[PDB]
Amino acid sequence: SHMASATINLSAEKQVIRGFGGMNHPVWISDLTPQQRDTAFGNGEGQLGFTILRIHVDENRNNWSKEVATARRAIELGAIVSASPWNPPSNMVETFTRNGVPNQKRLRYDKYGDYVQHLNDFVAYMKSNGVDLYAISVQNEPDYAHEWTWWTPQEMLRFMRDYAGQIRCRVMAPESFQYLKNMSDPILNDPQALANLDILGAHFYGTTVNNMPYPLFEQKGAGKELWMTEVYVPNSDSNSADRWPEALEVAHNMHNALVEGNFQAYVWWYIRRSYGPMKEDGTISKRGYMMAHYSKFVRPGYVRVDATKNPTYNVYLSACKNKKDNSVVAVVINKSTEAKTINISVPGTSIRKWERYVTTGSKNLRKESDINASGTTFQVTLEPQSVTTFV
Numbered sequence: 001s002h003m004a005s006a007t008i009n010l011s012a013e014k015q016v017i018r019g020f021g022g023m024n025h026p027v028w029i030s031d032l033t034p035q036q037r038d039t040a041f042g043n044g045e046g047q048l049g050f051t052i053l054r055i056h057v058d059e060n061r062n063n064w065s066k067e068v069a070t071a072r073r074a075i076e077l078g079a080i081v082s083a084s085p086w087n088p089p090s091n092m093v094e095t096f097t098r099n100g101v102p103n104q105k106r107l108r109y110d111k112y113g114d115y116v117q118h119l120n121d122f123v124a125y126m127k128s129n130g131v132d133l134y135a136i137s138v139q140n141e142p143d144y145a146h147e148w149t150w151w152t153p154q155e156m157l158r159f160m161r162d163y164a165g166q167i168r169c170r171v172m173a174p175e176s177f178q179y180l181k182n183m184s185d186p187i188l189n190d191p192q193a194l195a196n197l198d199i200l201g202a203h204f205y206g207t208t209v210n211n212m213p214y215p216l217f218e219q220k221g222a223g224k225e226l227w228m229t230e231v232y233v234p235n236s237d238s239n240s241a242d243r244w245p246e247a248l249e250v251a252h253n254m255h256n257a258l259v260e261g262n263f264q265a266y267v268w269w270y271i272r273r274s275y276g277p278m279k280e281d282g283t284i285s286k287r288g289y290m291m292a293h294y295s296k297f298v299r300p301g302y303v304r305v306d307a308t309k310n311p312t313y314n315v316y317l318s319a320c321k322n323k324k325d326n327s328v329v330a331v332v333i334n335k336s337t338e339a340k341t342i343n344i345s346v347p348g349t350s351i352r353k354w355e356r357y358v359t360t361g362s363k364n365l366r367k368e369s370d371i372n373a374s375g376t377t378f379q380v381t382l383e384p385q386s387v388t389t390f391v
């Protein structure tokens with residue numbers, strides 16, 4: 001009557017979750033402190049439970065040592081590390097005019113081999129320092145490189161087809177600023193380039209929900225991972241990270257990445273920033289608690305399953321299964337100003353009790369009363385303007 005229904009189908013397995021996290025950049029900003037590394041990558045009370053660290057590949061190898069402390073610590077705490085370059089070493093770059101704008105940067109065509117060696121050198125250096133990179137990217141935002149190095153779709157294709165097989169690591173590409181398919185379609189449509197791809201990386205700046213599905217990747221991307229490797233939402237406004245109900249957009253963007261995009265990873269920009277998941281004082285922001293609803297509970301290796309995604313207006317549901325014991329983690333967002341009651345059917349489960357943690361404008365991951373199932377149905381109530389994780 002006033003009650004919507006949802007079904008979680010534990011037998012309809014979607015993508016395996018790789019993880020959640022954010023960026024460290026100890027050259028552009030201050031490195032994470034030891035305390036901040038634990039807060040980010042630990043999963044104790046008051047910690048974010050991140051499992052992915054993104055770092056940059058500096059054009060100047062003399063900066064590489066600055067990455068090590070944080071990356072080692074992340075790995076020790078159970079995270080994986082991916083690395084993205086913004087520019088090649090300046091001796092490999094040339095200028096050109098793009099769309100009438102002069103003095104734009106690209107990798108010299110005669111330096112693609114030397115660029116592979118630069119990337120391989122970084123991989124080797126980090127490995128020598130106890131940082132076995134999960135992946136390394138060809139280029140950060142090759143299609144939004146006003147302030148860095150541009151690659152056209154065909155330049156990226158040439159590198160992926162003719163060079164990237166020499167990289168001694170998983171290769172990530174193309175990290176389009178907005179997941180523009182023109183950057184990635186040529187890779188997926190060329191068998192050698194596709195063979196040399198390991199992770200399709202994408203950013204989400206201005207990416208609408210209708211542009212989150214990718215039919216070509218569904219068709220040709222078997223064995224390749226799909227990662228959303230950078231965003232901040234809904235803005236990078238100074239001191240915005242505790243704004244409420246604005247922060248609910250973070251949860252909604254993550255729900256969309258997972259359910260509308262089938263993404264296996266979701267990685268914020270700077271971990272510690274006034275608009276990020278960790279505030280400058282080292283404590284978790286409202287935006288951070290939005291991330292934590294997923295990161296603390298949907299651990300690497302869980303598998304997303306089919307679940308009614310939008311059971312009623314302003315309510316969004318995702319579900320992931322732990323294949324070790326077929327338990328489920330459900331993250332449910334209520335953006336409504338009204339409370340919502342959902343009958344969530346989980347056919348075939350032997351689970352009969354969920355614990356729940358709730359964030360609103362006035363509390364953070366507050367543990368609330370357990371939900372006891374009637375048979376295989378869990379009736380939940382969602383406070384106005386809230387996110388709840390059921391576990």
Ligand SMILES: N[C@@H](Cc1c[nH]c[nH+]1)C(=O)O
Nearest residue numbers: 140141144177205230269
């Ligand atoms: N986060 C990007 C900047 C950006 C905003 N929008 C697109 N790109 C960077 O710092 O490299």
